[PDB]
Amino acid sequence: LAADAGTFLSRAVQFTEEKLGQAEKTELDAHLENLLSKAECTKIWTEKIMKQTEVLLQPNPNARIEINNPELLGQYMIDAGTEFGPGTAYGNALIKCGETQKRIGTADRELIQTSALNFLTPLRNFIEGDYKTIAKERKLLQNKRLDLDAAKTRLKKAKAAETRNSSEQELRITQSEFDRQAEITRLLLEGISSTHAHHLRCLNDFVEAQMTYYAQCYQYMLDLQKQL
Amino acid sequence: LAADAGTFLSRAVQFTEEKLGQAEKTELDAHLENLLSKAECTKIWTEKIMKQTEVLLQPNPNARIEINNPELLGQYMIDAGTEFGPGTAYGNALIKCGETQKRIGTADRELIQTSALNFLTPLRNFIEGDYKTIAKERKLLQNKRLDLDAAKTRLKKAKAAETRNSSEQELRITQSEFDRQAEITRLLLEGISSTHAHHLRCLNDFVEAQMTYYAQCYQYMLDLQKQL
């Protein structure tokens, strides 16, 4: 209850003095330190790639917030050709081109849905399922470290019998707690390795989707050329 | 000088009477009417098609007013690969994919240059030339028609035989200018026939451009698949 509030205040004091430079800072084991850094970079890069991919798939920002451009152009062409006269060669071409443009529009929508269910979703799930969990452990680990240094300062300021005696007992518990949290954090950080391999498989899926999209559109264009 | 004001007054008054329905309106010959309508329709439809084509090629409105999305995504992927370790399989894939994404971006830029100069330019030229010239002559033709109807109104209101004879001469003068302007506009309207044939060749060029873009992109994607 109220005790919770007091503990928070003490933590800030230690943090400030460390930044002030009048206090030193305990360093985590290199292995754990390296693991923490690796996870951070993974989230940073994955976020950027996913966001830009969405912009590429749906160029219209308003549509991304939400008829695709290709089909709209096809609609105008068909209507114009009818007015210009279906028999007239110019009208004939406009009508056929409009139809082909609409077929291309269909292929685009298929690609967007396919990519989202095989690429955007898995990458997003990683941050939602793994990163968020790791974030919680990271915060708790830092909290324990702050308390350890705070007790250390008291032990350094040993000027009385009870001070020395209590400091030793207090530090013993603080050290053990920090060590316990370290083990749990290490385990989760170890899972990141599998995350990379999983993401690799999803990347292959995105590449395949684009190939199919371009192949379908190419054939559609070839047909229009023959008809025209 | 004062003549300018006088001419405006006569035209507006007669027009208002016709609008009110109290005054009758001299109609034009069917041939000229048909030609004028055809030209107007051509410009309206051509304007819409060209504008939508611009949106399709350059989805970004700001860029349309002026790096492409594909190349930017390529940059992110290559950078991430390095951090994740070029040797690492995940890093290798990210780097290769980014490179191909930039190549696709390059082909897009070529299409924009090729298409705009072979499709948008001609459509715009027609609207900037054939239509405008016709509109100017069409406006003067309406002014001449108003002068003719004003002369007819003066003629019917010319109770005095001598005044009516003067109105007959005035009517002949207005009729001659009116007929002359009709012929001038008619000649410009005949030009729209050639515009359609020219526009058809331009449409074929736009189709060819799109086919090349899709073909090149397909090959690029195929190569990336093999390397990965």
Residue numbers in the entry:
A (entry chain A), B (entry chain B): 11 to 76, 91 to 252
What does the primary publication say about this deposited structure?
BAR protein endophilin B1 plays a key role in multiple cellular processes critical for oncogenesis, including autophagy and apoptosis. Endophilins are a highly conserved group of N-BAR proteins that contain an N-terminal amphipathic helix (H0) and a 20-residue amphipathic insert in helix 1 (H1i). These two motifs contribute to membrane association. BAR proteins are typically dimers in solution, where the dimer consists of three α-helices from each monomer that form a 6-helix bundle with a characteristic crescent shape.
Dimers bound to the surface of the bilayer and dimers that straddle the edges of the bicelle have distinct amphipathic helix conformations. These different classes of dimers will be referred to as “center” and “side” dimers, respectively. In center dimers, H1i is predominantly disordered. At lower contour levels the disordered region appears close to the BAR domain, brushing the membrane surface, but not inserted. H0s are oriented anti-parallel in relation to each other. As H1i is disordered in the center dimer class, residues Glu76-Ile96 were deleted from the model. Locally refining the classes individually resulted in reconstructions of 3.45 Å (center dimer) and 3.60 Å (side dimer), respectively. The atomic models consist of residues Leu11–Leu252. Residues Met1-Lys10 of H0 were omitted as weak density indicates that the N-terminus is flexible while inserted into the membrane. As the bicelle becomes more elliptical, the center dimers H0s move closer together, and the membrane density becomes more distinct.
